[PDB]
Symmetry: D2
Subunit: 330 residues, 4 copies
Amino acid sequence: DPAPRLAGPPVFGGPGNDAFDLAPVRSTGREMLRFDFPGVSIGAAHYEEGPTGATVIHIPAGARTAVDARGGAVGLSGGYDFNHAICLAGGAGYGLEAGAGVSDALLERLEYRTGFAELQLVSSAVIYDFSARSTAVYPDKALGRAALEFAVPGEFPQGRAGAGMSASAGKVDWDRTEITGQGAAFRRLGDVRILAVVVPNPVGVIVDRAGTVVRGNYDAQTGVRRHPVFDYQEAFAEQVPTTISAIVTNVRMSPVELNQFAKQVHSSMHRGIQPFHTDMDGDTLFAVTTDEIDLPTTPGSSRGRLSVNATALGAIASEVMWDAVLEAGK
Amino acid sequence: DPAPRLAGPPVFGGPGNDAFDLAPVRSTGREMLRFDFPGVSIGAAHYEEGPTGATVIHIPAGARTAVDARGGAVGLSGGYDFNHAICLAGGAGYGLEAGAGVSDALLERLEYRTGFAELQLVSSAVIYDFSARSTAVYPDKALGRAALEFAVPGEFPQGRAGAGMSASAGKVDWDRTEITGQGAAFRRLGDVRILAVVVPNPVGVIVDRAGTVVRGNYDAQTGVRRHPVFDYQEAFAEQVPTTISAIVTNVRMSPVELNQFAKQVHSSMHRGIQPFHTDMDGDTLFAVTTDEIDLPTTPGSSRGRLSVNATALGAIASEVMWDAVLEAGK
Amino acid sequence: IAVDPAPRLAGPPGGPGNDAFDLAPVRSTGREMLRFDFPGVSIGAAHYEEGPTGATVIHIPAGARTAVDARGGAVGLSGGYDFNHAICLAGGAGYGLEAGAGVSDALLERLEYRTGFAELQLVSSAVIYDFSARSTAVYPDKALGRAALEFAVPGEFPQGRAGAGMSASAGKVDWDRTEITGQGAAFRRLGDVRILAVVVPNPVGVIVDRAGTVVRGNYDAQTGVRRHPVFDYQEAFAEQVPPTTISAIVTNVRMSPVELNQFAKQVHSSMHRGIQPFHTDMDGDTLFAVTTDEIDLPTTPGSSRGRLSVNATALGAIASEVMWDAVLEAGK
Amino acid sequence: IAVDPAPRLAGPPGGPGNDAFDLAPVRSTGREMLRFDFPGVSIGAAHYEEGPTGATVIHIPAGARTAVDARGGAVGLSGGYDFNHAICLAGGAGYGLEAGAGVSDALLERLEYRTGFAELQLVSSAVIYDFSARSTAVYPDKALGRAALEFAVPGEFPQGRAGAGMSASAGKVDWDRTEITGQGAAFRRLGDVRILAVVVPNPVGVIVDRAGTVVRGNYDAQTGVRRHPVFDYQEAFAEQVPPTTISAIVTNVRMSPVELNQFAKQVHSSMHRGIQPFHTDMDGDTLFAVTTDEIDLPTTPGSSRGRLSVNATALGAIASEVMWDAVLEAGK
């Protein structure tokens, strides 16, 4: 079991953006994941004054996207089927403004051309992170721009960085909520590349492949984390009577294939986050392809007649995302 | 590890319905689950000539329903937001006919009244089970009627029964596909009741709470089952370059609450079935409430401030469904 | 289209069900045959006089990519597949989905009971509630769907009271003003491009022509005219609150799944011109957009008539007119 | 509504962006003020002359249950919440969603930066692409959304070229025939029942009146008339293939989420009467249906005007006429 990171109770009444001269900081988190994915960059910026942040995945060429918005409490802007960037942020609905900062900077980079085909498209999604801190500072337009400016190829700052600065898990009761973080993982299989990025702020808890609860719902009185279903079932016997994420790959997929891939990978995250896709969550996954590599025409291999196709890619990517969720909770 | 139940390769060219004088059999499966849920009945009937079957959940008063049709290959009829019965069947799209048998018998029971408010509503979903046998016999109208006629309170035939007769799992390669079954589980918490019913015919495999693969993708050469992601990742390194279910409860939920509950419980099944919600699956879950018991107005209890609500019910029901999936694969 | 001004009030509704009768399917001929040229697409229509009720089957043996736009709040749909060998439209409300099983079974038998994934015969079915327009509980069953499929003829469609349209009706602010409609089709070929529209309007609302005249439904026998329903609705409100259509559009122009799905929404929404109100909570409105994927639109959308004049949107506008013509044939 | 027959061709399109200007928000007054009586619902409209481009904000401080019907194939939407304190409509395409952030920020500040879940200020925003109708890259930004919110006045709406409608335009088979539209509103009270419609039509299609006349968009300067786009589309096909609207409808009648969502689809589809074609792949058509949940429909739907005459469907029909009136004010 990891040491606890209890968020502690929120002291409400704290200052907001207008009280500060807010200074973007490039997020470095606890350690840097390095990987090789040409054409993809990541920037993360935060305000210490929150603490809260945004994380921007920039794909300058633009890339086909499916969105799976699955929770009951989704905060999403654009949700486009083609994106030059994905912006994830804290600050609840207010933090969608970070995406406008990214959009504006892309327009300027494009010399303010505005033909239909040249529109710079940014989809943004948010987590509510106001309970995990004592200020009302939200990621703003300037912070979005900073995150884009900080974006570099082949790097991701793990842990408390960017949108993950004040992410937290395990919300049966706030006294047992723990700070998580943001996480990424990367796998290369021949020419195939899969990057997962995740900012888990779940009502549920993070669970590992052995079924151990590793982050969220920590009881200080007992020193142990519990699966929420134990609390829930006891409450019923007694009283009766959000995760935002992206999977980026270079494998060509049709719009239909890509959408089903998104749904598959997203549902797969109920393994590592439990419960998941609840009415209290606004879980949103972006599936993005750079469309560089074809699947073979027939799905066969030494490992099986139906072994090479988009379902197979979905299963592999599902493991990469689990690894990312675990990096976040570490 | 359970003994293998390999489906074996299909011998194609087999006879269909018109070759037989088809005789419904009341399915008893391997053992009977008994439970107490007034107002709910289950019947299961099969044709030995398939073997293939249908399973009918009958709720004569009628009950609010949400449908979560999540796969890429869904075969569904009605999908109504209010149902007097749910009919699950083999026979791929052809087996949707069983539901028409249930509908017709309900109409007759209603003395052929047809006012809007008296329409008898049956939603049906199917699995493709033609690979797991050597005939083209599909559940028909007569078999649907038989299943309804066989329906009794408080009983469910586990295993190879009804729609589960020729269900199978683990389809990276047919040489490793195993027969599953159908399954149910029941929990009562004070006055709250939760029944799960499932017919897993997944491309993926059934996995237990320890992460062990317990049914599907069995390799006769090695005597061991593998998680499909191992086959998939090796295939990629080499070559580059359906589950239908119902959750029935007596807790009142609004249409919005009930729909989100459906999505939550359905995603939860990616724990016990992996992969899940793939393009090759037609996964369909029905969430049905009898609307007999209110949740409290505020969600609080000794176990947490947010511990009694529909998300909490969803987490509990998710465990019941896992238990049902495991009964199916047993 | 010369709509008949004469009323055909459905009239007010313990009638027997199917097995009370020895039901023999009848090949529907309706009031008139539409003839059209669209190889690969066949239509069969069958009814039971004992209803009266019927089914109408579009048979496309090659299979064809399909988008389903199920817009109503009372939809009755089976399959809803993104690829179909047949579309089955039927009366009998939810019970009439059984007709689609008859079609499915017949197609399976024709294949000699082959059941490989690529060989699965896919039929999508949708229904109208037509029990208020008659005094039996007879519905389109397995045998009637099978019969409609067997009666399917290339390049013909029976207009009017035929197949699913036998007891279709419009204008349901009050049943005293509800009129029998029918089914309808219309067809257009524009240099190679073929568009077929099929419609069974059983609307809560009324059928309206291009001039804005109500031509079928909401006939007040005390005035001998048809008003727009909104006039009744607004009077009712002033008083009491004091201070299904199922259709297919089939084309031979290739469209991606995304284009075909938006084409389906566009054509379906366009039917709120010919049927008013439309897409209501009591309607189960369902449109099937089908492409046989025979011919490509040019790579670029240009013509002497504009830079954005040859694309799927343009096809949608054109198909929307073919659908309006079909609605008006049903109401004629 | 007396639509002006005179053309207002947008005309053909390296113009500078926001920071090139010292941008001062202007309170839009348009051509005319609509006045209406609907306590709790305010509208503010602000524009930058340097665009010209604008934002239009509907402010409902109590918060109100909302259904979003995003029907187009090119939708630009932020939030899309099922409960809103404001709806923000803007030009500037995707960049103009930023205006909604200005509104959101202002509302948060008004709350003194309280951030409890129940206190979250919810703004849904949708946009039109209005860059072809002008020669700058100026878009509605944070400051302009904030300004529109500050300018919001109970019971007034500026018709015409104002707020989001400043550079809205219709009829885009070819840009040479595209005309400037505007924004529009209309309001009806029927004994207690209040319905407000707000619309910013930037359609690919054209605005059409109740007689079926094209009144805005697709003006051919060589003929001095407006044809229906389908005439261009079908000629183009014969030749080349040889052998956004964002809107809100606000009412005070209580509707469940299910009813409100079907009400939204019904009213939105009804706009294919006034705008043709509509819901196309190049459109991002988005309608917001909002109820302030003030008054109940009777428990049963009866009246002297029919057994099914007082329900949400009826309200939908009535609101559909208010929306058509709003579309025509925008095109006037």
